[PDB]
From Swiss-Prot:
NCBIfam families linked to this entry: pol2
Protein name: DNA polymerase
GO molecular function, one term: exonuclease activity
Alphabetical list of InterPro entries matching this protein: DNA-dir_DNA_pol_B, DNA-dir_DNA_pol_B_CS, DNA-dir_DNA_pol_B_exonuc, DNA-dir_DNA_pol_B_multi_dom, DNA/RNA_pol_sf, DNA_pol_B_thumb, DNA_pol_palm_dom_sf, DNA_pol_type-B
Domain of life: Archaea
Enzyme Commission code: 2.7.7.7
GO biological process: DNA-templated DNA replication
Major enzyme class: transferase
Reactions it catalyzes: DNA(n) + a 2'-deoxyribonucleoside 5'-triphosphate = DNA(n+1) + diphosphate
Source taxonomy: Archaea, Methanobacteriati, Methanobacteriota, Thermococci, Thermococcales
């Protein structure tokens, strides 16, 4: 198994390094003979002799083209002949490429900005993360002594936690008789102890949660001050610290530094992105946070150090658990894209599509177009059209099918051979005309993108068959990740077409796919109404909800299935409609806002639920019960009653004052991000405990009847006690409860006025 590649420069010559794991052994192959290159398109071949003589002046050394060989390749549907220019060193390319492009006989240059070790992986047909090789992983976390005003890492690391197979431990330089803590003399010896358990565990994967930006940078500054050489690479080097945007990332040569933060932030959408937020919204259980200020308190103190050491080891065991969840996903993603897990897990989707495409263009001898210049990149600023959204039928309905298109946009790209290289080609014998926009896509030959996509969809189906046929659940889950990842890849080509930074950019292609999508949904909808008597309640882009008004459940199901057979014998090519699911009741408040229940009584919601910094359990409870009243009971009036009851019980003070805890997340440091509110009050009240409120730093609070404004008097539930404390019922009604249910009940004709009663 290939883990990674990079390159070193020795006497000015690049040497590729391959980091490998094979029969449980770590290996490093070196390749001294891989040659950087670019391609030049020349007006006349006789100009090559000028170009061979071009030379830059780089750090005093004359750099030139080492050789030139004429090659034949494909480029956007048409054959092309270009000159492959070799060089001694990859970094010779920038200095000499602008000079070559200056030559008046040079039309353009190509494939000039492709990182050398990534060029290696592609050109050599090598694929990271392939095979069955078991890989040893280890997570780690640190807790540090922090104090306001100090520079980064002015205070010592107090604990280094790690966690893996054997369990979770903490290393620290103060005595804690807890049995998972190991104690040593010094911060220095702690750090040496850490470096030593790594050497002897020798993991292939190092898992952190935001190690790219905190842990590794801290451990660097500290080991510098203490004069320890932070040796983590199996090759004798310190962690290497790249830039990526403003923020940074860290490599550990010979191992994979798997930072879960970039990975999580692009998978499940959490409100905030703390390690606690992640764990509770991935695994289910909760996790305690210990603020920085309390850790400083506990370390200067005797006791309280057992709780913090719990929080430290609990940083480490969850990171290893989370890493065990998200790693095989990224191993599968590395196989598919053909790039290292390190790069794969830190990269934007359009960027992973482009590395997949670059590998395919090489396999097919297809010359890559260039990324756009700044001015072209501003030209590609179109707003796109977006698929068909039907204004929904209002009110409550029963016996609903959701029908949808199997991979609608891939299906279309293949079916209509939609590709920059097939766009408005001349003398074409066979073309499909995109509706509305009128772009003509030649079908005399397979387009580059369609020809890649077809095998992807095929492979996906072959993987799903293997998934279901293999009894072993570890394998099933691997195959399931692979399957899903293929489908995300395939579903990303539509967006790639409009992606402004795309090498194979194609606005016409994007406009055409969207338009075909509209046509297929619209006519499919018209068909089921006019031929099968269905009523389409709502539709968004690749699917619709429908019922037969009056029919019973088995009738709509059975007729839904007949219509699939009908319409699928009519849909061209790969276009196919499938029966996704049946819903006993549902309602569609507006476009993108609806809720439905299936026969398992599982309610599914879209555009209605609580996404809020200010979420409270009286709100979440009350929204949940009105949905249950509309969808389980099919009783909208009761839903209204429930809101009236709950607003009454809030004002007559009969409501358990803790479900009125507002767990709020902080976005900006308390500079009045919100002009005022509960947050500025609870900040003052927990500055009493010594805590400052920083981004993250979840704040739980109850809002009390005070003077001044409603919602200006707030305290932590810590300091609450049901005597000399009354919650402000008006805040909980107008700010928590009614906003959670207004939208649902507006869909049934009720205004906020109707949802209370006082006088």
């Amino acid at each position: 198994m290939i883990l990674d590649t990079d390159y070193i420069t020795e006497d000015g010559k690049p040497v590729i390094r391959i980091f490998k794991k094979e029969n449980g052994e770590f290996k490093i192959d070196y390749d001294r003979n891989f040659e950087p290159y670019i391609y030049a398109l020349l007006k006349d071949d006789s100009a090559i002799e000028d170009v061979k003589k071009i030379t830059a002046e780089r750090h005093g050394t004359t750099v030139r083209v080492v050789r030139a060989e004429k090659v034949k390749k494909k480029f956007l549907g048409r054959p092309i002949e270009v000159w492959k220019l070799y060089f001694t060193h990859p970094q010779d390319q920038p200095a000499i490429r602008d000079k070559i492009k200056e030559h008046p006989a040079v039309v353009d240059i190509y494939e000039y900005d492709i990182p050398f070790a990534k060029r290696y992986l592609i050109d050599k047909g090598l694929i990271p993360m392939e095979g069955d090789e078991e890989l040893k992983m280890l997570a780690f976390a640190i807790a540090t002594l922090y104090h306001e005003g100090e520079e980064f890492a002015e205070g010592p690391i107090l604990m280094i936690s790690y966690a893996d197979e054997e369990g979770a431990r903490v290393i620290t330089w103060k005595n804690i008789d807890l049995p998972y803590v190991d104690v040593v003399s010094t911060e220095k010896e702690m750090i040496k102890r850490f470096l030593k358990v790594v050497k002897e565990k020798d993991p292939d994967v190092l898992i952190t949660y935001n190690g790219d930006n905190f842990d590794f940078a801290y451990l660097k500054k500290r080991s510098e001050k203490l004069g320890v050489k932070f040796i983590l690479g199996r090759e004798g080097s310190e962690p290497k610290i790249q830039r990526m945007g403003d923020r940074f990332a860290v490599e550990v040569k010979g191992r994979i530094h798997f930072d879960l933060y970039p990975v999580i932030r692009r998978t499940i959408w959490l409100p905030t992105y703390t390690l606690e937020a992640v764990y509770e919204a991935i695994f289910g259980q909760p996790k305690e946070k210990v603020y920085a200020e309390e850790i400083a308190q506990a370390w200067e103190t005797g006791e309280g150090l057992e709780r913090v050491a719990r929080y430290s080891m609990e940083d480490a065991k969850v990171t290893y658990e989370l890493g065990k969840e998200f790693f095989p996903m990224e191993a599968q993603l590395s196989r598919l894209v053909g790039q290292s897990l390190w790069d794969v897990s830190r990269s934007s989707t359009g960027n992973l599509v482009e590395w997949f495409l670059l590998r395919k263009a090489y396999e097919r001898n297809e010359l890559a177009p260039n990324k756009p210049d700044e001015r072209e990149l501003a030209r590609r600023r179109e707003s796109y059209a977006g698929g068909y959204v039907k204004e929904p039928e209002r009110g409550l309905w029963e016996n609903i099918v959701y029908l949808d298109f199997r991979s609608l946009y891939p299906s279309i790209i293949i079916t209509h051979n939609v590709s920059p290289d097939t766009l408005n080609r001349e003398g074409c014998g066979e073309y499909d005309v995109a509706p509305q926009v009128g772009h003509k896509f030649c079908k005399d030959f397979p387009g580059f993108i369609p020809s890649l996509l077809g095998p992807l969809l095929e492979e996906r189906q072959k993987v799903k068959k293997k998934m279901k046929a293999t009894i072993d659940p570890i394998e099933k889950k691997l195959l399931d990740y692979r399957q899903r990842l293929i489908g995300i890849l395939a579903n990303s080509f539509y967006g790639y077409y409009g992606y402004a930074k795309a090498r194979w950019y194609c606005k016409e292609c994007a406009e055409s796919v969207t338009a075909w999508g509209r046509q297929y949904l619209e006519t499919t909808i018209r068909e089921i109404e006019e031929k099968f008597g269905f009523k389409v309640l709502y539709a968004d882009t690749d699917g619709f909800f429908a019922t037969i008004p009056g029919a019973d459940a088995e009738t709509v199901k059975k007729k839904a299935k007949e219509f699939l057979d009908y319409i699928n014998a009519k849909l061209p090519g790969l276009l196919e409609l499938e029966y996704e699911g049946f819903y006993k009741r549902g309602f569609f408040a507006t476009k993108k806002k609806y809720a439905v229940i299936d026969e398992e009584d599982k309610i599914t919601t879209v555009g209605l639920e609580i996404v809020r910094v200010d979420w409270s359990e009286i709100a979440k409870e009350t929204q949940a019960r009105v949905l249950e009243a509309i969808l389980k009971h099919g009783d909208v009036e009761e839903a209204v009653r429930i809101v009236k009851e709950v607003t009454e019980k809030l004002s007559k003070y009969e409501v358990p004052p803790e479900k009125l805890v507002i767990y709020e997340q902080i976005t900006r440091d308390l500079k009045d991000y919100k002009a005022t509110g509960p947050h500025v009050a609870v900040a003052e009240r927990l500055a009493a405990r010594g805590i400052k409120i920083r981004p993250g730093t979840v704040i739980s609070y109850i809002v009390l009847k005070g003077s001044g404004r409603i919602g200006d008097r707030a305290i932590p539930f810590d300091e609450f006690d049901p005597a000399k404390h009354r919650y402000d019922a008006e805040y909980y009604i107008e700010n928590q409860v009614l906003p959670a249910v207004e939208r649902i009940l507006r869909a049934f004709g009720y205004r906020k006025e109707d949802l209370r009663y006082q006088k």
